[model samples]
Target: GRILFVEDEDAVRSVAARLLRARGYEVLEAADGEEALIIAEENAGTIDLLISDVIMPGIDGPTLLKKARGYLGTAPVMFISGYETGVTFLPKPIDIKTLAERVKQQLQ
Candidate 1:
């Protein structure tokens, strides 16, 4: 499955993107929300999941999700953050193992 994984932090995003790709998922990496928005728009229905950081310099996670959902049509979303909000949340200081597991869960 193809995944759009957005994060403002360079290292964090790279690590996750690399791992996801290694796990056999195609990952589209975005530095921030604007890039993500463009990718989401261009890819449209092809994106299987959106994994993003909750807070970013521009176009934060929820806002991006709201806009991207229009093109994605119910593609699953996962928000990575320092705080917990519920089932959809992946807490920061992201655990690669946990993330890989949750990605499987969401995509299934």
Candidate 2:
């Protein structure tokens, strides 16, 4: 399945994409929320999931998800971040295996 990964940091984006690709997933990379939205919209029919960093320039994760849904309908989403908050968050510094597994599970 195809996965759209949006991250502001180039290193993070590259690593995440590589890991997901190694796991047999077709990964699409984007530098920021705007790029992500454009790519997701263009590939809406093929994208099976969205994995994005919670904090980014242009748009945040929640906003990006909401906008993407308008074009691609509702697809599974997994948010990754290093920030901390009182509310529950997807644990930070996710490993590739766990990340891919979570994405697969959510998509199912």
Q: Write down the TM-score of every candidate.
A: 0.93, 0.86
Question: Candidate 1, residue 56: CA error in Å?
Answer: 0.5
lDDT of 2 by residue, 1-108 (tens): 888888888987898789778878898899788999899879977777778889898899878887787655566677889981111235568776787667767777
Candidate 1 lDDT at 93 equals 97
Give the lDDT of residue 39 in candidate 2: 95
Q: Compared to the true structure, candidate 1 yields what TM-score?
A: 0.93
lDDT assessment of candidate 2: 0.78
lDDT of each: 0.88, 0.78
Report residue 24 deviation for candidate 1 (angstroms).
0.6
Model 2 alpha-carbon miss at residue 34, Å:
0.7
Worst 10 residues of 1 by lDDT: 81-90
